[PDB]
Design a protein around this ligand. Structure first.
Ligand code: HEM
Length: 420
């Protein structure tokens, strides 16, 4: 797979409609994504690009149209992939890229790990880790929030969800980064197929051991609240290792789904607060805004820019005809900035009344399974921030990640001022 090398993105008004290529993974880093999507929403809301490095595709960029595509599982398929391109020549079936009814069967089998009753049992540990992390950070001198907080809290969460050995939690993050980030799939920075195969093999050995280990301990160990515990308590799933593709798939999806999304929500809120510092004063006055703010963070950031589908038949949309078999990209990042839905869509407004109606988790049968865990982690982060810090300043332009899919930060230099 060829690497994507950064070059300067031209002003969108300099281009013919036919030439707008929103698969470029530097649109986010260079700040051009907003104007590019505005033009599409306004002049070509259902747009066909016949020429791209990932092959041809439709872009759907308005909020209401994206809702329709996402909810229309009768017209659009999630199979075989939901990223714009393709993973390497043969690398792990996951229910995010499956249609009902098989989709439903697989998702039902793992969804209890994020049931409300279950999340209630994790809350104390999340809060204690969050507090410990924030207590460890330097004050009045800049540090990189991305490894210090966002990645650190996330890797700990991911290990808790499996019962993954805590001292090896980094491997979950690294394995997930390499998959999420294949150049061939998302225009991401990872171009070595061999390292992916090694990760795939190593992750399958690691999961297979942890399963056999936990079976051995469950003898007389009480089950915890992790996914593997729960799967080996439900009679339908207790044999899951005897179906290798479903076993590796469901576990991998859980880890990949919550890895960069939560990390980038955790980083993105500081970026939005730094761009609209009045909001942080508003928050300090009205701390009961935290739950609505979490929604507004998630909007505003939109951690995953899109999900892709294939048209099961010809479909009329936005004054066009999507043909059977065409790839179709639902641009959440565009829909969350659609002024037809959200007034002043680029402003971060903690008390925005319809923040909860964001599409960052999508809608329909694939709507994010981990949505409540993400919201719980983020509320707790901000509760714990608000107890400790009078200000939280970003001191350098953030470095943003190369990807058409992930909307994230690799460097975020922050200076904290304690309250007393
Ligand atoms: C802010 C954080 C998150 C964002 C923005 C996010 C976003 C998404 C999106 C856009 C989808 C597919 C939606 C669609 O196709 O309509 C999805 C699915 C999924 N997410 Fe998340 N997610 C986040 C956090 C999490 C976490 C923490 C986990 C796991 C603990 C997770 C697990 C999943 C899974 C398993 C699915 C597949 C659901 C299915 O296909 O039925 N997500 N997520």
């Amino acid at each position: 797979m060829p690497e994507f090398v950064e070059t300067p993105i031209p002003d969108v008004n300099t281009l013919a409609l036919e030439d707008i290529d929103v698969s470029n993974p530097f649109l986010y880093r260079q700040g051009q994504w907003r104007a590019y999507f505005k033009r599409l929403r306004d002049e070509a809301p259902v747009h066909y690009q016949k020429n791209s490095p990932f092959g041809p595709f439709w872009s759907v960029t308005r909020f209401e149209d994206i809702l329709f595509v996402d909810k229309s599982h009768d017209l659009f398929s999630a199979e075989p992939q939901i990223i714009l391109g393709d993973p390497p020549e043969g690398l792990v079936e996951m229910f995010i890229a499956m249609d009902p009814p098989k989709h439903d069967v697989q998702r039902s089998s793992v969804q209890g790990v994020v049931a409300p009753k279950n999340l209630k049992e994790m809350e104390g540990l999340i809060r204690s880790r969050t507090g410990d992390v924030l207590d460890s950070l330097p004050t009045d001198k800049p540090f990189n929030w991305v490894p210090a907080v966002s990645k650190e809290l996330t890797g700990r969460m991911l290990a808790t969800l499996l019962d993954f050995p805590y001292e090896e939690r980094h491997k979950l993050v690294e394995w997930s980064d390499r998959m999420a980030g294949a150049a061939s799939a998302t225009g991401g920075e990872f171009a070595d197929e061999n390292a992916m195969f090694d990760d795939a093999a190593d992750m399958a050995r690691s999961f297979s051991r942890l399963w056999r280990d936990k079976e051995a301990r469950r003898a007389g160990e009480e089950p915890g609240f992790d996914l593997i515990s729960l799967l080996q308590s439900n009679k339908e799933t207790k044999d899951l290792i005897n179906r290798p593709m479903e076993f590796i798939g469901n576990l991998t999806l859980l880890i990949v789904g919550g890895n960069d999304t939560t990390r980038n929500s955790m980083s993105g809120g500081l970026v939005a607060m730094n761009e609209f510092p009045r909001e942080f004063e508003k928050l300090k006055a009205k701390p009961e805004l935290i739950p609505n703010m979490v929604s507004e963070i998630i909007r505003w950031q939109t951690p995953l820019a899109y999900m892709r589908r294939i048209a099961k038949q010809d479909v009329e949309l936005g004054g066009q005809t999507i043909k059977k078999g065409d790839r179709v990209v639902m641009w959440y990042a565009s829909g969350n900035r659609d002024e037809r839905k959200f007034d002043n869509p680029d402003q971060f407004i903690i008390d925005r009344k319809d923040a909860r109606n964001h599409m960052s988790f999508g809608y329909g049968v694939h709507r994010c399974m981990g949505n409540r865990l993400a919201e719980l982690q983020l509320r707790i982060l901000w509760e714990e921030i608000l107890k400790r810090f009078d200000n939280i300043e970003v001191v350098e332009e953030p470095e943003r990640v190369q990807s058409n899919f992930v909307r994230g930060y690799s460097r975020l230099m922050v200076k904290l001022t304690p309250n007393s």
